[PDB]
Assembly symmetry: C3
Homo-oligomer: 102 residues x 3
């Protein structure tokens, strides 16, 4: 694809990763305040946002693997940063809630 | 801009991010040892280094969004990784301190 | 080097970081269940893999700093995201284990 397509998709990712990010942090706030029902609900919601903007990552990487030359985009790079850090938080949040739960 | 400018800006972001991270880690060591006061101040200090490194971020996105082709730089990419991972630490640090403060 | 070469090194980075990440997450599961000796074991193993990927990172950045032009690769940008998020987790894991240990 061209640079402009990569930039727009990067923006989509920045949007969804950003949304998932706020939900996960709000979940941490809820857990801090002993409101675990809300904490869990929020995490479950953040999960969908991530799954959506994530499955696109796979197809993108597979294309380069199979010979496609993908153009550089600072926006795409930025979206991936948002996505990957948010995913790490998602992968570790259960323990944070659990620690607040104990 | 040229690759040289991107690289140098990258070094700049790495320096600020690096210091922000060291302080956040140091803040953790403090909270672990009960020095919550030292931990809190350190967290505030970290935020300033982050504000600096984070500065150019929006501008870069805007330039590319308006149709400007920004050069690829490993150093810049690495700086962005440092910044973004450090910002996540900053976003979570409060809960790790609180859990230590309970 | 060419893009293909950059992509191959990136795959290597993803392998080391992905493996390290699963050990660190497994280390978290262990600590959660009170198996602290297992937790430390995994963290020590993960560090070995991280050391191999991180060392490779240093050389690359240095190559650009010395004037060398390196090709952009989505896989390398992805491997770096994996490595960088994994290094953050490794730097913060001790405090998570300790919190479960308290
Ligand atoms: Mg990145």
């Amino acid at each position: 694809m061209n640079r402009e397509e990569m930039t727009l998709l990067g923006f989509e990712i920045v949007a969804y990763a950003g949304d998932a990010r706020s939900k996960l942090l709000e979940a941490l706030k809820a857990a801090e305040n002993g409101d675990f029902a809300k904490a869990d609900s929020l995490v479950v919601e953040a999960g969908s946002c991530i799954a959506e903007a994530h499955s696109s990552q796979t197809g993108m990487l597979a294309r380069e693997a199979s010979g496609e030359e993908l153009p550089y985009s600072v926006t795409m790079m930025h979206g991936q940063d948002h996505l990957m850090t948010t995913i790490l938080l998602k992968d570790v949040i259960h323990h944070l809630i659990e620690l607040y739960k104990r």
